[PDB]
């Protein structure tokens, strides 16, 4: 159930219903945001099925949603640290 | 004007790539990499620090996405 | 509401369960295969919301799912081509 | 043992990577950029033919999630 949201993160809800809203309207808008809502919900109750980019930083897993990629990692719980578009991904170094 | 040692591998890969039209010359093919190291290096740095920043922004502890939705939609 | 759906993606869709069963139970598997459900009803009903990368093949979407991406195309309808894990992601060449 | 023209700019970029911890040397970076080109040509050729199949492989049109998730658990 629980899991904690930082601003940041907030910021790029806000962002990516900004961009959606413009380019298509408030319906849609609205189902990419529930879409978004349905994969962090997901991560949330399923922690470990993210796939873990250790390389990239320590603790941290990614899950995707449409265009977008949720960056997250679990401490006392599920923290949500950034919502960002697949075209920031890279191949982290081991 | 530099220059570089390639092993057989490479000798071999930079012409399969200019035999066929994908480039022409050594020089480009070996370009065309260090461009997608050099964008990869960037995007990587840039992704690091994007998170940091989302760990040094704090916390929301009771998210209502059912009311961002709302609100966002009376918007 | 309709789509095509392609018999290896269905292929995609079982391999998928299969592994996701195996590796977490059922319980996980069956909301897994529901991300990927949801995401395939809103590539029907938005077509034009997938990225296209029309480098990569012509007139080919993706829209990504948890640790996958649906492949797309539209004909008389939505054609979903083919389901694959991200890690077979690449830099479509101009 | 070859010989090549860079940018001014990836000649620089390979300097201040080579003067960063990340290579020993212009050749190592070289190839490191070449490793990338040449996976990323494979993964696009395998990628292509996983579309391809997809393509090739026929077509459900009416086909019910709901009863799919069923089966695969009953």
Known sequence: KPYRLSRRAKAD???????????????????????????????????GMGQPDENLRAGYRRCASG?????????VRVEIIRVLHQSMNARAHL | ???????????????????????????????????????????????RAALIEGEESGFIEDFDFDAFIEERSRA
């Open chain 2, 1 to 47: 004007n530099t220059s570089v040692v390639l092993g057989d591998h490479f000798q071999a890969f930079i012409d399969s790539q200019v035999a066929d039209g994908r480039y022409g010359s050594a020089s480009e093919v070996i370009r065309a990499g260090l461009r997608l190291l050099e964008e990869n290096e960037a995007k990587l740095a840039a992704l």
């Open chain 1, 13 to 47: 809800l806000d962002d990516i219903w900004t961009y959606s809203e413009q380019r298509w309207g408030v319906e849609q808008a609205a189902d990419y945001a529930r879409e978004l809502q349905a994969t962090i919900e997901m991560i949330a109750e399923h922690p």
């Open chain 1, 67 to 75: 265009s977008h990629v949720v960056f997250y990692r679990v401490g």
